[PDB]
């Protein structure tokens, strides 16, 4: 009958890059989901396969709180059946996704005047990600028939680029913190309720 550590994910001081997203595993606790959604602090709080208000009266075997940072333009892609550089090469939601996507603008916390290049995304990859695939390989992307052997140049580029977050960027070019709550099923016993 312990309360869930949702505060530890949502209110975490530093978040992750989107290609290297986190999976805090939630287990054995009570979650007041209605405390989270009435927060009215989110520019995006869009579930799928379940209702936000009916969520309090429910249970699951495991809740997975995935959290990362992207731009506001790409928030649309944190959804089932999306394309784009984030949806394809960084974080992919299944077409049978049954959780919630939550996002809020982070330009105050996550942007430095000289430019904050701490956050990153994956720009080059030979094929799309499987659902919930995390790819942290920094291997020089090969574009030609000629292999790279860890030496940049023509047809041989670093697979990762950097977000350029400045407080004067456009609102879409601004950083948005995303938290993705994935819900499983029963058959196996449940540990998270409300």
């Amino acid at each position: 009958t312990n309360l869930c550590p949702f505060g530890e994910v949502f209110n975490a001081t530093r978040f992750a890059s989107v290609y290297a997203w986190n999976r805090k595993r939630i287990s054995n606790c009570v979650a007041d989901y209605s405390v989270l959604y009435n927060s009215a602090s989110f520019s995006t709080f869009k579930c799928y396969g379940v209702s936000p208000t009916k969520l309090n009266d429910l249970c699951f075997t495991n809740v997975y709180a995935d959290s990362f940072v992207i731009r506001g333009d790409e928030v649309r892609q944190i959804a089932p059946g999306q394309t784009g550089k984030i949806a394809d090469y960084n974080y992919k939601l299944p077409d049978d996704f049954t959780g919630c996507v939550i996002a809020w603008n982070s330009n105050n916390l996550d942007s430095k005047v000289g430019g904050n290049y701490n956050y990153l995304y994956r720009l080059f990859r030979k094929s799309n990600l499987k659902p919930f695939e995390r790819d942290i390989s920094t291997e020089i992307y090969q574009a030609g028939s000629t292999p790279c052997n860890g030496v940049e140049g023509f047809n041989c580029y670093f697979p990762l680029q950097s977000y350029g977050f400045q407080p004067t960027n456009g609102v879409g070019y601004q950083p948005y913190r995303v938290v993705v709550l994935s819900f499983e099923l029963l058959h196996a016993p449940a540990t998270v309720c409300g």
């Binding site: 394309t83 550089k85 394809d88 720009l123 094929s127 992307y141 030609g144 028939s145 047809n155």
Partner: protein
Amino acid sequence: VQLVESGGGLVQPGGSLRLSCAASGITVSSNYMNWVRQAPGKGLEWVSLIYSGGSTYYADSVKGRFTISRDNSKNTLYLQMNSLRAEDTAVYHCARDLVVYGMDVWGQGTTVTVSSASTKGPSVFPLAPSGTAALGCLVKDYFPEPVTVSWNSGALTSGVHTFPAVLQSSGLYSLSSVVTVPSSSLGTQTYICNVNHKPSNTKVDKKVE
């Protein structure tokens, strides 16, 4: 490092055609590849994007009529055009996008034309005169492109002006070619324009007087 476009030609309105883009120096399946067309005398218009991962995007003017595909071992990018219209008449390029590093490799392209037009024949009418004087030849009502206009079978070149063709209301091209010569040499020199329209098997030598 090349991008070689094929497939372009003439299509009636409502018909379909497929363009090819043969590559060497880059491998197509690993790259972002773009189709970008250019109508005559217009600017660059983005048409079709295709991710390394196969994700596709299309511009609204061609959404539903165009399909972008590739083929790994043949290293050839394609573009299937369906239900073609007159606006799609353009030169079509394929390029390798590096997103941040822009598009660093382009192809000279293949030309696409759309029209329920036929072929007819370029009628050559004289532009006769009556310090300096001017005479010319009016090449009118031929289609499709293009025509070659020389003067005196190539001898006279100084002062020649061959105009770019204009497309008349009938769906028919037409241009003029002129030359300024000294006003005195009107009675002594013979001026004949040489016109050739290879599509319609049409060559004409018209004397201007």
